[PDB]
Every structure is written in C-alpha cells, then in structure tokens.
C-alpha cells in the first residue's frame, strides 16, 4: 500500500528550468516511480492512494475500493490551486490509513502487540520548499491540528502507527540552469519543517535539485519498501560496555530503523506485550506508543539458546550496524535486550531477547525470545510459581506453543481485565461506521459552487453566474444556446435535421468523440463473419 | 545636449569636442535594457559559455524581434 501525497497548492505553479511547473515534474516522477516499481515482481498486491491539499471532503481523491484506473485519472487532472495546509493533509492521510485497523484486529491494545500483523504504507508528501501558510500568516513549527479525534485514538497518542513511514520530496529545482552537479553519488537532506516529522516516523527526506538527482532519489526510494517493523533502540543503561576488542567512546544509540519481517500473512509468535504494569481492574487504559522504547544491554549471558522453541527470522535493516561491525559483529556472542517503562510489577526492565548476528555476518537476525527465557528453558511445583512474574494476558500466545507438547493450562486464569473488555465493541463499531462514511463520499465531489456574490456596498439574494467548463450546450434542443452570429445557418441546419426523419436522431451539433478512442472498444461492438482458417 | 557635461570653455585650440558624461550614458543604457528586456535571469556581466545560449533562446529571439521592429535601438547603442 502506497499513499502519494501531492499538495497541488498554488505555490506549485512556478516554472522549472526545463519548462514545466513543479506539479508536472511531481506527476512525472510519480509515473516513473510506478514504472520502476512495476519492474519488481511484487507489485501485484499493493494499492495506490492519492491525497491533495484540499478540504476534508475533497482532500482524498482515490482511497479504498479504488482501482488503478480512477487513481491515474484523478492524478492526471490535478490542479495546483490552494494554500499549503500540510498539517491538516497529513492528519487526513493518517486517519485514512487508520480506518480499517480497529476492525480487523491490528493493534487490539488488549492482547500484546503482534508484529506479524502488518499493514505497510509509505507517504511521499511531495510539497514545495518552505513558507507554508494557514490562511492567516506563515508558520514555522508544523504542528498537527487536533480538532476531531477518531473514536479509539487516545490509546496511541500519536497520529502515525507501527508501520507508517514518511519520505519527503521538496523539488528545489532552480529556474535558470540547475548546474549544481558536483557530487555525483550524494543525496543530501532538505533541512525543512518536514524533516523532523519524517525522521520521527523513520524515513528520511530527500532534497531534489536536478533531474539526475531526482532519478537517483527515485531509484534509491524503490529499494526502501518492505514489511514495516520499526523499533527504537537506546544505549541506556550500560555506559557503552562494549569492551570486547577495543575501547568505546557515539551516534549509533537512538536507532529507529525498520525490520524486514518476511513471511514464509506473516508467521511468528512471542510479541512485545506492552510497556506498563496491567492491573486486573483498570477502566482507563494507558496510551501505547507507536515506537516501542526497548533498550539493550551488552552482556554475554549464555548466547547459546538451542531448544524446540518456534523460530523467527525478523530481519533487521542495517542502518546503525557500524557499532556492531567495530566489534567483529560479535562472533558467537550476543547482548540482551529489554523493554523499559515498568515491564513488570516492581522492576526496571526485563530481558526478553537478544540481537545475535548470523553466521554470514550480513545483518542482525533480531532473535525474539519469550518474556523470560533463561528460567523456563532450564515440575516440583515450580512452573506454578514461575507463571506469576509474567503479564497475565501474555499466557495467551505462549500456551499455543505448549500445544506442541501437551495442555496443562486452561481458561481459568485467562482473563486480562474485566473493564478492558467493556467500551471496546462500541469503539470498533464507531470506527467501522466512520470508515464506511469516509469510503462512501470519496469520489463524489458535488461542488455546485458557481456564483459571484454581488454585494450592495431581488435584494440581498442576487448572485451572478460564473463560466462553466463542462456545460455541453444543447444547440438542437435548447434555443438559448444558439448565438447571434451563426443563427440562420444553424436554423437551416436544425430544419434539415428535423425534416430528414432519419434513425437515431440526436440533439448534438457535432460531438466527435471523447479524449480516449480505443480500438478494441470500438471493434467489440461489431460483427465479422470471418475466422482466417488458412 | 543632455549627456554632454558643460561645456563651452573652448577646449583645445579650435577643435574642442565635449566628452559624454559616464553617468548619463550609464542611465541611458540601464533604461534601454529595462525597456527592451526586463528579464534578469542572466543579467550578469560575466559572459556565459556558448552552450548556455541554448537555454535562453526565447529571450534572444524576443530581443532580436524588438531590435528588428524598432531600429532606433541601434542608434541608442551608438549613444
């Protein structure tokens, strides 16, 4: 799923050095991105959406239940007229991407946080350089407005989601020559108000300066689409305890890269449950975070973990692997990882996995382990006392693995909270109704706005008409659509047309055809008694 | 008469020729450039390379048309 955000604002009317405006260059770049992505044999399941800088009823051009034909037709007729309302457009796009999330089961907020339930989405937000306006002045903060929150959105406290990356294109093409071609293989950043918003999600922001640089950035962007598993790392709290082959001193601490969870839907178990201590009676649930604040500690702690535990291959995208490569990729050794923010009743973090590398030393495998592996792996009334340290709802998925061996547990203590189940079906129904109402009025514009609003300065109610583009005057049916110049000739033409008594008469003077004239479409409505047997 | 600085002191022996003021001729050239082509994309004094002339062909053609429609411009250049 790819949602292209093209502003089509009035500031996108300035002409480049090639002769076309920035909007035409953006549309051409989108078309070349389409034809480049079509090369990879994986573009048979994705869906394209379009978002412009227009009113909430008119911002979306093609959303759910819209094929490629209507999407291309809407992107073709894009007009650059309006202000640069970036915040409202980003909010509308994020709400559109989060319409079918509370109904299928993604981010249920009650049963862990399953990383194998993915809904990838990439935003391009092709906008102008700077100087965004909000009908009052020029702002320099880019704060997303919060006026009408969706039902069930206060449990994340952030507009974007687990898998929602945000790339940006500014299209800073000069007007005279664009002769800046010193650095060949180098794509700098835009350094604008959208740069922090993009970096928070996990995607960079390109700075287009030349058509060659545009082609380079488009060819570099097609290689950044996969399953979205974005997790945040922190150096705390080990004081860079990497004393293995050298001495530490770094910027590879707050790594917020993605992870490629390739399927073999995705197959996996043992998710990151949450970051708080869930109580048995809690009417209000604390809001989750889109990026989990999980921290790693550099300790050997028996990296050899061999068992019949179901295996996972959530591949990690190499972005800050320099710190690992400095220590020879940690051969035959790993380092634990633990989620912060009160992972248990009374403690600060519980190691639930590690980041052991592969034998090929190519990337990090991201070995996800159970909540507390070094205890259950090595019954004398031990498991009954051990199952009290883990979160309650967490007994859900692990028991499935126990199904591979037997079934000692039951549904006696399989209860998260009596108040968490309530006020959940109503929120899901409200979200479904909102998604249906949004998908219903998605393409039907029905503007019907043509007036001059004649002010005084039949009274207080007059309004002069405006020039209608698609008027289609009926010359043979309506007599008012016949001007004075070609009146007598048109009169004789109408007379001859009425006195001819032909078959299948029409009221159009000369209606040649539409913009498209297909050969197969016209040849299908015919009959040819021939087969060419010879 | 407007640009020549005064002027009338019998310079030389008998063939005194008054010089033209640089400021007046500079102002004349400036207003001529502003009237002929008000564009400023390539108004730098440094002459660009030859290939650069392949991008602003429209401005050169409109300047040629303005010169061919009014020959007085050439005379102004002589000033």
Swiss-Prot record, chain A:
Single GO molecular function: transmembrane signaling receptor activity
Tissue specificity comment: Widely expressed. Expressed in heart, brain, placenta, lung, liver, skeletal muscle, kidney and pancreas.
Cell compartment(s), UniProt: Nucleus; Chromosome
Assigned protein family: Belongs to the Integrator subunit 6 family.
Membrane-spanning residues: none
Quaternary organization: Component of the Integrator complex, composed of core subunits INTS1, INTS2, INTS3, INTS4, INTS5, INTS6, INTS7, INTS8, INTS9/RC74, INTS10, INTS11/CPSF3L, INTS12, INTS13, INTS14 and INTS15. The core complex associates with protein phosphatase 2A subunits PPP2CA and PPP2R1A, to form the Integrator-PP2A (INTAC) complex.
GO BP terms, alphabetized: protein localization to chromatin; regulation of transcription elongation by RNA polymerase II; RNA polymerase II transcription initiation surveillance; snRNA 3'-end processing; snRNA processing
Residues of the full protein shown: 3 to 599 of 887
Record's protein name: Integrator complex subunit 6
GO-annotated cellular components: actin cytoskeleton; chromatin; INTAC complex; integrator complex; nucleoplasm; nucleus
Swiss-Prot/TrEMBL induction comment: Frequently down-regulated in nonsmall cell lung carcinomas and prostate cancers. Down-regulation in prostate cancer is due to CpG hypermethylation of its promoter. However, some involvement in cancer is unclear.
Main location: nucleus
Protein's job: Component of the integrator complex, a multiprotein complex that terminates RNA polymerase II (Pol II) transcription in the promoter-proximal region of genes.
Highest taxon in the source lineage: Eukaryota
UniProt KW keywords: Chromosome, Nucleus, Phosphoprotein
Ranges of residues in domain VWFA: 1-225
Curated annotation (Swiss-Prot), chain B:
Top-rank taxon: Eukaryota
Residue ranges of coiled coil: none
Location within or outside the cell: Nucleus; Cytoplasm; Nucleus membrane
Name of the protein this chain belongs to: Integrator complex subunit 5
Function description: Component of the integrator complex, a multiprotein complex that terminates RNA polymerase II (Pol II) transcription in the promoter-proximal region of genes.
UniProt organism field: Homo sapiens (Human)
Family: Belongs to the Integrator subunit 5 family.
Signal peptide stretch: none
UniProt subunit comment: Component of the Integrator complex, composed of core subunits INTS1, INTS2, INTS3, INTS4, INTS5, INTS6, INTS7, INTS8, INTS9/RC74, INTS10, INTS11/CPSF3L, INTS12, INTS13, INTS14 and INTS15. The core complex associates with protein phosphatase 2A subunits PPP2CA and PPP2R1A, to form the Integrator-PP2A (INTAC) complex.
Residue span relative to the full protein: 785 to 863 of 1019
Lineage, highest ranks first: Eukaryota, Metazoa, Chordata, Craniata, Vertebrata
